[PDB]
Amino acid sequence: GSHMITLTTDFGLKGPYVGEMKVAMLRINPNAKIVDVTHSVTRHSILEGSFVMEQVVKYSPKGTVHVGVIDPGVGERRAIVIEGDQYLVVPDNGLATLPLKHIKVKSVYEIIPDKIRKFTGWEISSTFHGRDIFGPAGALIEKGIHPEEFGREIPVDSIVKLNVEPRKEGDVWILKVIYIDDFGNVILNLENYEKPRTVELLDFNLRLPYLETYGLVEKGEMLALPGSHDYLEIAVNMGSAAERLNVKVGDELRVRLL
Amino acid sequence: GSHMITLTTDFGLKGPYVGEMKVAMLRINPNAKIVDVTHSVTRHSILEGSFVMEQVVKYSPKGTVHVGVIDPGVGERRAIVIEGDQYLVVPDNGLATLPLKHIKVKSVYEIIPDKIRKFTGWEISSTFHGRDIFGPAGALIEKGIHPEEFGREIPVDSIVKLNVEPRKEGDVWILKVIYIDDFGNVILNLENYEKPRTVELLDFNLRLPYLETYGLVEKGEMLALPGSHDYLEIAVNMGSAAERLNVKVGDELRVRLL
Amino acid sequence: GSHMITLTTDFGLKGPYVGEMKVAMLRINPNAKIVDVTHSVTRHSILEGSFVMEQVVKYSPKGTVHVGVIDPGVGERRAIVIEGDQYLVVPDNGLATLPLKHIKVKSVYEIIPDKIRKFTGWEISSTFHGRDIFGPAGALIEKGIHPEEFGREIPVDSIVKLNVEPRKEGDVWILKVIYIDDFGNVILNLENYEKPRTVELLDFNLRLPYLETYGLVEKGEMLALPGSHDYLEIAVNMGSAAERLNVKVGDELRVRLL
């Protein structure tokens, strides 16, 4: 109970999965301070999951333990602990990629199922590794159990990495949708850019004003804004950019800043 | 960690916003007892948000701190702390209106961003004031930091108030939909009324029996009931009144009690 | 705060209901460790609720208190406490049936509303017994208040039980859908079966491979798998079996194992 353990998944909210994972954790670490991020990441989207954990890592105190489980390839992908000034407990499938931009890494461990089972006492399922591997590992780490006790160290440079950088051709960026929020605001992977006056969505016949807040255009109008995530956000004031553009996470857009 | 801090937002559940706000809070107040109400208030509905906080305030113990963030007009609206036998930490946009029916107010403070930034250490975003202003203020207040330290007192009668009272013309009430729940039950702003035998929805050709519970009519039938909120509830037994009537929050209905 | 109190409901996430119930609980038991399972059980589905509590009970430590509220028949159904090596606080409507497979029961109590009101102080509503009866009873039990103090013992064999066993005709099972998760994976009430090589959905013209993980078939293909729940799961790799089969909880399917 010294540090927080955060949870990010695509498991969904209807059913037992999250509760099972939490009770498994609290079994091991009864004083754990378990903080939900989301369990509503778009199904199997390791990209959107990575974005979400990135934002939470940026604001968490050092020593925080982050459990992330978006795991379509569950089965012989590795389960890993990344040990840094913060911890990540994640499938080795590139989920760690964005949060890793903000963590100084000391070491990486592959979790050994046999050694986890020692601590839990129950059969490791083929598919629900949040309950049987990742949650327990997070709880154990926060309890002061060294990853060496349930895993073995592996090279930091061996882990799966997502391709997340945007492309630029001349004055045209080719940007990827990395997150869409419940408003339908659309987050694109452009960061560290000088603020423009205009953002052109070349594929859509739209030249959007770049403004600080939604209420600086009429209701129903589309704009671009900084948002709170240090990327580029496209929004409809009191509406859904995602619906109007018919875009989804992973879609690429041609974008010019003017 | 002496009193509860409740959270009510329209931020949604898919993404990092709620987790960011929580970790920001726990940074400041590691022992905070943070209780989620909802983050699924209808987008930008200050009215439905106010209703939801009203119901939670009614059942919370004195000293409880209520953070509410439904903030379409974020940008030069004020961020305020209402100091009473309970606290409200809200945008000055009328969200406080219904909960204020149940709080004895001592004083009101405008939060000064510059003074909050002193405590957090990070740049205040243009749009995510839950993370950068409201959550921190709630955490600070519960930690025993006086609002005077990060704000300045303003008159209680200067704050934005929602128009929430129903209208009556003769024997006809003109009622507003203030909440629709996940069942599609429809809550109308009529309170403190003598229970009728019948509730006529004049616009809809319906004369509904007023009954204590859903199971007192056949499945699929519509009724009116008291519910648990001290308003008037319209429901379909095992169905959705909202869908059948095609109504939304803010819609007005002509209603007669017989 | 010695043991966990878990919460499973169909109340939904949009609105005040869950927050009200939690603040009522924490009023009574300020140190309660309240663990959300789900509030997104399919409306009024006592069957799916029972499944969800079953899975959480299986992984909770002894002494855990489980509050379950899926209560379409609220009104003269009983409110009960099941006292065992774990506790259940539930409507007497068969919600307890699946979790009871995993609990050694000592005694059962009917909650007496008048005696609960002694402890809460407020009027018991006709419909929101989570806030006014079940949550308080859970909080009180975890606080060390004996059920005898707010109820009266009743025979364990008098409580409502769901019919949950599958039927078999020759080599054909008639299985019921007991849960559908957020992926659209479909859980059928077949347990304790020898793993087949093939699962035929006789009604659908499908002969599915039985495999350990989703990624063992092409994307879009349907399979059967063990899952993590000790039942039988039907899934589309990276899709929705529920949508493809057009099935809902309670639907019955003819199924042959080959």
Ligand SMILES: Nc1ncnc2c1ncn2[C@@H]1O[C@H](CSCC[C@H](N)C(=O)O)[C@@H](O)[C@H]1O
């Ligand atoms: N598209 C939109 N139009 C108008 N207001 C919006 C909006 N999207 C979010 N909001 C308002 O923004 C408030 C704060 S949430 C801000 C989220 C934004 N994407 C960010 O990263 O900063 C919410 O209460 C919501 O009502």
Ligand SMILES: Nc1ncnc2c1ncn2[C@@H]1O[C@H](CSCC[C@H](N)C(=O)O)[C@@H](O)[C@H]1O
């Ligand atoms: N429209 C409806 N028809 C039948 N049962 C309903 C219903 N709406 C809610 N319920 C049942 O009510 C139970 C308790 S929630 C009650 C909510 C109600 N609006 C109130 O304020 O009191 C739930 O478990 C749900 O299954």
Ligand SMILES: Nc1ncnc2c1ncn2[C@@H]1O[C@H](CSCC[C@H](N)C(=O)O)[C@@H](O)[C@H]1O
């Ligand atoms: N139908 C499906 N196809 C592919 N992957 C799936 C899937 N359903 C769940 N998953 C993946 O499974 C991971 C773990 S959740 C596993 C749930 C499964 N029903 C069980 O009881 O074990 C999730 O992160 C999700 O991305």
